[PDB]
């Protein structure tokens, strides 16, 4: 009902003279005119006197001086709820998969203050990524913010999508926000999610590289608002109300670049690396909303998996250090390891999880503490391995065991493993039950062992899964059951 007129269409910013009674983050409409059937919105942010500069959420090519605008009476917000599940949507919440209009009853404002300090609890429940190395050495707990930082084509999106795929029966609602990614890549990712049936519990927010920089700046906030709706209210998934959500903000380096464009085209002063002064505040206010609320405030959680792309393995840049200082850990993917065949490339030395080590199944920690120890031994002895077998015999055996473990961590794409399978495999690898197996055959040994357990011994997997929470996981009964299973498999092999 309240209106204004565009007096100058700048570098993706309209000016909107005479639009009083507009709130400081209102979403203006630009109602459709001849030559433009659809409405394209904008965010009124600089509410100065007799002028309301507004960032246009879309291509500015379509608007013109004198065009009417209509303030919608609402702060910038996106549709949320159960209707978003299985829908690829715009940052504005408009669908782009073409399946139909988004059905929703309530819309949550994006860009809110995170729940706070008292409204939180130390993460205790684990997020099963399905990657042996990540689940064993960098545990991720529900409500934890784990940065997936790497160097261009390293497998960051692959790790995130493997995590999203593994949350099938885990009572988790995944969200994948593609910020600045190529539309072909987002299409391929959505196809991967659909073919594996993971789209039935996944929301996708797509702000591709061609999209205006106004989008790709509210895309992570739209995804986070949807995730917050899951976290606080919850949605019905598989007939069970789930209040846990997992959000992959994807490339936040492109998010920071988009906000740099938005700031510089607004003639804001540049800061370090030409980024605005509040790029840290951008990422912090985004990510701090990913929390683990205590039982008083609903008990829900929102797991964030931001992705940062580094240039030439430079983890000491501006945005990567910002997000490292914001998030609770790092999954550092190395390019050298990626090219050397260790396709789940993981710099185990410096990849870490500040919180969530306690949010691990007791079986996993009880089996993987010595795995981390042995990997540390291998990384320590790699320097001394330059000598042609001049070291002593037991440390040669340690180096060989580390090589076998490293081959074990190597895992193919699109094949997540249940926690029972992971812990059984690591039990086998760490009890010296693989020292006779040659190195190149270890991946096939693992695959055959898992097939054997799936087919021959379902009961062992069920027993391991049921007994994964107890304080002392290697109980005599499960110990002997798994011992018999592995001895039978090795005799058969």
């Amino acid at each position: 009902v309240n209106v204004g007129t565009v007096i100058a269409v700048g570098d993706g910013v309209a000016r909107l003279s005479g639009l009083d009674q507009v709130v400081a983050s209102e979403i203006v409409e630009f109602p459709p005119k001849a030559g433009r059937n659809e409405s394209i919105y904008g965010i009124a942010l600089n509410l100065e006197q007799d002028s309301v500069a507004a960032i246009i959420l879309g291509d500015d090519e379509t608007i013109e001086e004198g065009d009417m605008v209509t303030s919608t009476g609402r702060v910038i917000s996106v549709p949320v709820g159960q209707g978003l599940l299985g829908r690829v949507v715009n940052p504005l919440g408009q669908p782009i998969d073409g399946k139909g209009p988004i059905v929703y009853e309530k819309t949550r404002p994006i860009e809110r203050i995170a729940p706070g300090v008292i409204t939180r609890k130390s993460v205790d429940t684990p997020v099963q990524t399905g990657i042996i190395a990540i689940d064993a050495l960098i545990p991720i707990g529900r409500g934890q913010r784990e940065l997936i930082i790497g160097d261009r084509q390293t497998g960051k999106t692959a790790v995130a999508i493997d995590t999203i795929l593994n949350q099938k029966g885990q009572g988790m609602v995944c969200i994948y926000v593609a910020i600045g990614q190529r539309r072909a890549q987002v299409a391929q990712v959505v196809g991967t999610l659909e073919r594996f049936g993971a789209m039935e519990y996944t929301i996708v927010v797509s702000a591709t590289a061609s999209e205006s920089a106004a989008l790709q700046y509210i895309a992570p906030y739209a995804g986070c608002a949807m995730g917050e709706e899951i976290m606080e209210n919850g949605v019905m998934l598989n007939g069970q109300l789930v209040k846990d959500a997992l959000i992959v903000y994807d490339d936040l380096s492109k998010h920071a670049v988009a906000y740099r464009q938005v700031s510089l085209l607004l003639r804001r002063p540049p800061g370090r690396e030409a980024y605005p002064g509040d790029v840290f505040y951008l990422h912090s206010r985004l990510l701090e909303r990913a929390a683990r609320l205590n039982e008083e405030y609903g008990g829900g959680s929102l797991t964030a998996l931001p992705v940062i792309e580094t240039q030439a393995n430079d983890v000491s840049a501006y945005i990567p250090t910002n997000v490292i200082s914001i998030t609770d850990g790092q999954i550092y993917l190395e390019s050298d390891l990626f090219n050397a065949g260790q396709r789940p490339a993981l710099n185990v030395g410096i990849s870490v999880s500040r919180v969530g080590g306690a949010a691990q199944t007791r079986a996993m920690r009880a089996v993987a503490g010595k795995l981390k120890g042995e990997l540390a031994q291998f990384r320590d002895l790699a320097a001394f391995a330059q000598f042609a077998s001049d070291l002593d015999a037991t440390t040669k055996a340690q180096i060989e065991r580390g090589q076998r473990l490293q081959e074990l961590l190597k895992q193919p794409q699109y094949q997540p493993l249940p926690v029972e399978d992971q812990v059984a495999v690591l039990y086998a690898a760490t009890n010296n039950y693989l020292d006779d197996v040659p190195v190149p055959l270890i991946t096939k040994w693992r695959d055959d062992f898992l097939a054997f357990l799936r087919t021959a011994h379902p009961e062992v997997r069920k027993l391991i899964y049921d007994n994964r929470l107890d304080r002392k996981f290697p109980t005599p009964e499960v110990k002997e059951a798994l011992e018999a299973a592995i001895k039978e498999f090795k005799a058969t092999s």
């Binding site: 291509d59 987002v186 920089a213």
Partner: protein, 466 residues
């Protein structure tokens, strides 16, 4: 329409229009120049009351403030269709070759189109069989994917460019587009005309099977900025016709630099090396209409000049963000290998994964790269010690690496300084098995020097028989 020029500062003008009917952004306002010719300026911003700031895209030296300005009501119109095949255009779509104007009956599409929507994208990536041996094996193309070629003033860049058009016509539709962004008037325009017109396959010149768009060095920053989009607009007609199109962009870095210059002239704040703040968005407007859609596909190949040796430079970094394959022409191998001098170790490809090109192709490519890496590691030892200190089980691999680096030669249908060898088009299915057999001990008998432009393992056996 019918505005007046308000202000001229270099190649950035400001035309005042009535309060209503102001030009939109990228509306290609036209200035008559007192004759048949005219100056086409692209609107880049709207200011004040009816004032629009536009980039000249021309000489803008004879202009005076107050001249009539005509608003065309749409972005720069570009002729499209078979009428553009075998013709050479500038950014505005006018022909710059000897032939006459295109004419009014030919369709004209806006230069500023949207990319294919999300639902039109291809879910599954498919290899774009090029016909090369080293490329179709080490750095396979992607149908509708961007590919980089490095090396600067290397060797084999141009011959690969013509051979890809020759093969794409032989296998795919054939139609091709060359976007000479910042193309030198002497080096890159007349010489490439002669090379394309002289190069002939099946009684058809490669020139007749390609449309060339040239934003020259001498043209202002706007022309070099939008020449890539002009080439895309010309290619998208044939893509919409269902044909497979190969788009060649010469030095995408010059597109980036033209964008930087336009942003600097427009007064925008710089970004991180002085580049445009809209670097990602500008590189996304281009290189995102280059995709494989349901109807057709535009595969691409973009030469990239890395500023100095800094690949992390925002320009090559944002280019690499949009790349699906890389081919690295190296000077050292170019010292003697004037056949495609692709460095197999430095040339990578995203699609070279078991899931897409198959398990056999991945296995063979990885084995070839392993052997060549072993030779690269032992190169210093061979130079210093010799062939005798090098033990058994590696001398075989060094000889095999010599033979396989020699077997990355391809006899071309069209070539520079034509060597007379018959043209050959080797599919990926043939290349994978050929290199597998070369790695399987066969071919150890023929000496290393007789691998010049052989082409196929069956041809290797035939050459050994003689």
């Amino acid at each position: 329409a019918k505005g007046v020029i308000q202000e001229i500062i270099g190649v950035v003008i400001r035309a005042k229009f009535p309060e209503d009917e102001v030009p939109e952004i990228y509306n290609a306002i036209e200035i008559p120049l007192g004759n048949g010719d005219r100056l086409v300026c692209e609107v880049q911003q709207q200011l004040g009351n009816g004032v629009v700031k536009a980039v000249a895209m021309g000489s803008t030296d004879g202009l005076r403030r107050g001249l009539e300005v005509i608003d065309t009501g749409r972005p720069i119109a570009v002729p499209v269709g078979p009428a553009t095949l075998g013709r050479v255009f500038n950014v505005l779509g006018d022909p710059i070759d000897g032939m006459g104007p295109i004419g009014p009956e030919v369709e004209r599409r806006p230069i500023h189109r949207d990319p294919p929507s999300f639902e039109e994208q291809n879910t599954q990536a498919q290899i774009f069989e090029t016909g090369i041996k080293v490329i179709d094996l080490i750095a396979p193309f992607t149908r509708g994917g961007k590919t980089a070629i490095f090396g600067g003033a290397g060797v084999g860049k141009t011959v690969v460019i013509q051979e890809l058009i020759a093969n794409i016509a032989k296998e795919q539709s054939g139609f091709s587009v060359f976007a000479g962004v910042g193309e030198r008037s002497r080096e890159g325009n007349d010489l490439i005309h002669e090379m394309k017109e002289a190069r002939i396959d099946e009684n058809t010149t490669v020139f007749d099977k390609t449309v060339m768009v040239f934003g020259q060095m001498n043209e202002p920053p706007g022309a070099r900025l939008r020449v890539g989009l002009t080439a895309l607009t010309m290619a998208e007609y044939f893509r919409d016709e269902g044909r497979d199109i190969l788009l060649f962009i010469d030095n995408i870095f010059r597109f980036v630099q033209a964008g930087s210059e336009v942003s600097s002239l427009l007064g925008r704040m710089p970004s991180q090396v002085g580049y445009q703040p809209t670097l990602g968005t500008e590189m996304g407007e281009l290189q995102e209409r280059i995709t494989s859609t349901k109807r057709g596909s535009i595969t691409s190949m973009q030469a990239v000049y890395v500023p100095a040796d800094d690949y992390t430079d925002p320009a090559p970094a944002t280019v690499f963000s949009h790349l699906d394959a890389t081919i690295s022409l190296e000077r050292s191998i170019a010292e003697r290998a004037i056949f495609p001098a692709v460095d197999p170790l430095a040339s990578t490809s995203r699609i070279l994964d078991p899931n897409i090109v198959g398990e056999e192709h991945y296995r063979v490519a990885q084995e070839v790269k392993r052997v060549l890496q072993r030779y690269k590691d032992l190169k210093d030892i061979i130079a210093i010690l010799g062939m005798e200190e090098l033990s058994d089980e590696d001398k075989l691999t060094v000889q095999r690496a010599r033979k396989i680096e020699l077997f990355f030669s391809q006899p071309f249908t069209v070539a520079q300084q034509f060597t007379g060898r018959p043209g050959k088009y080797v599919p990926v299915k043939k290349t994978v098995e050929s290199f597998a057999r070369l790695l399987n001990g066969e071919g150890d008998h023929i000496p290393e020097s007789f691998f010049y432009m052989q082409g196929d393992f069956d041809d290797v056996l035939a050459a050994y028989e003689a």
